[PDB]
From a paper:
Here, we determine mycobacterial MsRv1273c/72c to be an isoniazid efflux pump and determine several structures by cryo-electron microscopy showing specific asymmetrical features including an N-terminal extending loop and a periplasmic helical hairpin only found in MsRv1272c. Confirmation that this is correct was achieved by mutating both E553Q and D497N, creating the double mutant, which has little activity. Together, these results indicate that the consensus site of MsRv1273c/72c is functional with normal ATPase activity while its degenerate site exhibits very low activity. Thus, MsRv1273c/72c is a drug efflux pump for isoniazid, but not ethambutol.
Using single-particle 3D reconstruction, the cryo-EM structure of MsRv1273c/72c was determined at 3.1 Å resolution in the IFapo state. The central cavity is located between the two TMDs and it opens towards the cytoplasm. The two NBDs are separate at both NBSs. In the IFapo structure, the NBDs are separated both at consensus and degenerate sites by 8.4 Å and 10.7 Å, respectively. The N-terminal extending loop (includes residues 1-16, but only 10-16 are observed in the IFapo structure) of MsRv1272c wraps around TM6 by forming a right angle with the elbow helix (EH) and then interacts with the sidechain of Trp246 in TM4, which is conserved among the mycobacterial Rv1272c homologs. For example, the region containing a part of the D-loop, a part of the Walker B motif and the connecting residues (554AT555), which we assigned as the D-WalkerB loop (552DEATSSVD559), adopts a classical S-shaped conformation when the NBD binds nucleotide.
Numbering used by the authors:
A (entry chain B): 9 to 624
B (entry chain A): -1 to 571
Amino acid sequence: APLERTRDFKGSAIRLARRLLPQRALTLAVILLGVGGIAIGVIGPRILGHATDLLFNGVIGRELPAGLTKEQAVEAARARGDGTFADLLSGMDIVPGQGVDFGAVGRTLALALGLYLVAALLVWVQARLLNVTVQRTMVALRAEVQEKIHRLPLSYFDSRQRGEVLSRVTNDVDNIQNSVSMTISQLLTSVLTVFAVLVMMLTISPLLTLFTVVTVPASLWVTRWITRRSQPLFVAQWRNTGRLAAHLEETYSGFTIVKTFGHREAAAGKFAELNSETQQSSFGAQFFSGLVSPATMFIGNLSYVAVAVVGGLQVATGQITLGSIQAFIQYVRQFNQPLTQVAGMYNTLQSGIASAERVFDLLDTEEESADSPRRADVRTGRVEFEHVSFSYVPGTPVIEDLSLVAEPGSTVAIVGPTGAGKTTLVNLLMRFYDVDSGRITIDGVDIASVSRESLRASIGMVLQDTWLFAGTIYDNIAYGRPDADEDEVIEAATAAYVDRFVHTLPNGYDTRVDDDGGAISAGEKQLITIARAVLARPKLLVLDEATSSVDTRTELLIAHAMAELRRDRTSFIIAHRLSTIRDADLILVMDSGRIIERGTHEELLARHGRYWEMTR
Amino acid sequence: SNMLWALLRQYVRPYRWLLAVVAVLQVISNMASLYLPTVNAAIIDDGVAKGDTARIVELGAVMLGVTALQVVCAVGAVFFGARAATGFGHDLRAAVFTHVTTFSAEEAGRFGAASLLTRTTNDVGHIQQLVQLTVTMLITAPIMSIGGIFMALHQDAGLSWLLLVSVPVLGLANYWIIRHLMPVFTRMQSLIDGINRVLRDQLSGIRVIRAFAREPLERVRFAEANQTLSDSALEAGRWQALMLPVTTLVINVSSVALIWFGGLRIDAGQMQVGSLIAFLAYFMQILMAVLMATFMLVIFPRAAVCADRIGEVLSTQTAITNPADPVRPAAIAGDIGVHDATFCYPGADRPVLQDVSFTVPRGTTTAVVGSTGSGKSTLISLICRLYDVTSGSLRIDGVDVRDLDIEQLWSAIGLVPQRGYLFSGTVAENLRYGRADATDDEMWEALRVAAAADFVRAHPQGLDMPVAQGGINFSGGQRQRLAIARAVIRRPAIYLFDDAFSALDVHTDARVRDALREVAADATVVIVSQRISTVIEADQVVVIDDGRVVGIGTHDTLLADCPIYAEFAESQA
């Protein structure tokens, strides 16, 4: 994004600061070391200026006739028509008949060298401690985000858009880290530098500092003007890049159709247009960022010219020594430095606080239900629904009065038009969503007045989307019960028809499924999932019979494996195969939600209507 | 490494004069920024050492001109640098796309529809950012360094060896620090990608994690990844901590030594004090410029790997191309005539097809049924020259398909691929890809023969329903029946249904098949399918197993004498 509506800047920034709080010893040390390394960095050029004065008071002042004090020398400069040279002399510490006093210059530079060494050491140590504290807070922030992710209800992850939480948790924390490191280091250093340099300038002469500080409002106004002018040129670049990426991805994914239907020159023409349009906008944006870079340097150079000329005119009349103006020129450079960075500092700080607002509004949602501490013992699996009524959206209901009687060996099936929300019963059973009224009784107890670990560990699910994480095949199958030896995991991977494809692969049981996977065919992934489910020895199955890229060998393998998984378990099968729907007991059709039918396929075949024409 | 310059020399070639102007303006800007302190030194020598003050005012007038010149040159450099850095990047991503749109899906299957996109979108961005930063921030290092040595030689050539000893020491120290810092930086980036992958895998499977109750096992894994990334970031910052103090220490020790030796030189009437006032500025500016260059130099290996990717794309030569003399017939009949095709993949030893030979008559369908993995989609994609045969012939009623003007062929081909794709817009536009001038009745008949007019008639918008990016707002049957409608619009001579029927309801499957056989009577159809139910209606169903046509003939004769009957029929039914 070019910018972002922050929607709160005081609360968010104070909340982030109190996040940084617990490392208060480290932050105090960082601040004190910064103050020290800045003081010793602004009291250096003053001592170098004293050394330059020691050189000047001797290189001009050894040529005067010896014997005279610095009143008769000045008067002799006057009488010979050198009034301004007389001013210059009367501003010095002349002793006629002298001229380098190199011991004093030696001692002055020896003092400055030690101060510079100490300042370097202090800056290094401050950098180390700042790094330590930034990492110590980022670790805890990420840990908090994770502990939250594992408590949010599924309604949260289902309501959000596609790929939004992943951005809330990945890129926003990086933005926060950048903002924190930048603000501490650069803002603290630059503000303290400006303050110390201003104090030193006031000590030297209160007029050239007037110049150096009257040049500031112009710098800030120019920065504001250029940023205000450049924002509408960043929104255009972001927009045009979005359009270009959209056209590219929709002409790359559908390339066979783009090509085989004729529209191969039209795609090139539209791309040429989008390419020109994104170049013409990237140019403007980059040019204006450029512009804001050296305009502040121009204004700083105007200030520096004014300082140089007026300082020369003041030293040349004996109102300021030469070391003072040398130190002042150094101070002018050090002061005009951060006025060029202010813009980028503000940009990154604003981006970071917007990201922090997003993350802290993620971290303020509500946790699911604080489940009861009672273990569930599903001895048989006789599920009984009791007047359940679900909504999915308070108001319009999806389920109505429902009284499933799922017996131990039963195979309750759900057949209907795909997209009718056929997973509502699945979500109700695993307790991903609470029921608004009713009672789901799993062999006496009800899934609401029991824990969730025990219940969900005594059910077991086999869904449409096969989930495999980065790791071996052995790790994925041991995910079902990660305290069983290779004997049990291999017995599981043999119960499902995995061992065959393991033999086919070069390094079976250590092949990374997603990393360099390549050939698992996404029909063997379903077998890995069935093995993972058969390892956890469930007692009450929830599972769907959908397919993907139907083969023959793998299709028969999946059918037989998922029919031997349902040995005696009570199953809530999302039936998409004729063999299973033929052998069922409480077939349900879902009319966009709304189970409205019933029957054992016999009274449902005599009164078929929707039933037979749907299962045809 | 060797490829980054290979394209960074070729695609910046038109903007040579722009980079020359950028360089000759940066030189002037930096020389003026260095010439301000020497006018200040001339103020202190010719001004406050004698009684002159008019000389101070004149030299102030000179400094005004110098700073105006500097700002003009700096703004010009910014302008031309931006112009060139966007021209290179408007040309790179266009030579990439004009290449990628010449592949043949056998050269595009190697990269993937997302790696291609990122290669032509963000890699060019990463190289263009490097060009921008190397025309606005890296050029100030050599210019300022050499100009500072020359300004010091001119000012007083007895203290320029302070520059000649202070610049190499700083450059060498920073080279050592950078050499030690780069590997841990790349490793930290890899660990960042690792933790992002952990988060993505935890968020995409938040139901499978909550089932199996494996939350305590997913917290430990993330804690491990987090602590590892933190340790790597600390070890990376352990050198950025050093990088700046070394610079400031070199500057300050050089300034102290400057005062000492310059005073020893002033004493013996060989210098003025303005030289002291100027050399401190020379030191500060030069060494800060070198520091900033070393800061920025950490961005190069990323550009190297991105340019490796882009060169990989721009290197793969294309095989399928229009012929030399495009023999063209008046009208493409469509009597496909495959004779002895193999199509061995680029790298493997297993010719997918082998000795394939059969003829589709002028108006009859032909189902190519076989094991999923025996290479039949290869056969379809060979008919419409997406892949190209390695040996054999692919006649289209007389002419080898490697001699036809490919646009003619593709204009006489109605293809329905395996997965359905719909482009962003209105359903009217997607259906407009077929005929390009479609009256409403035409779209309606093509949508009812596709069994898809129901959900596009029962919608408030009607025949303008908003379609998502890849038709993802629809689902399954909707998308495939919209693709079938798009193909039926054209009324081509050859309907190639790649699979096109598997992801469909069997009842509506029979409905659309019969609708076609009613409207597609005078045309050739070729259906590659695994399900046998859609195959009984064929006329010349051919079997394909392990790349051989083992079994040709009507479904009845085939079921009479072939293993296909037993295996496939008894496995399906």
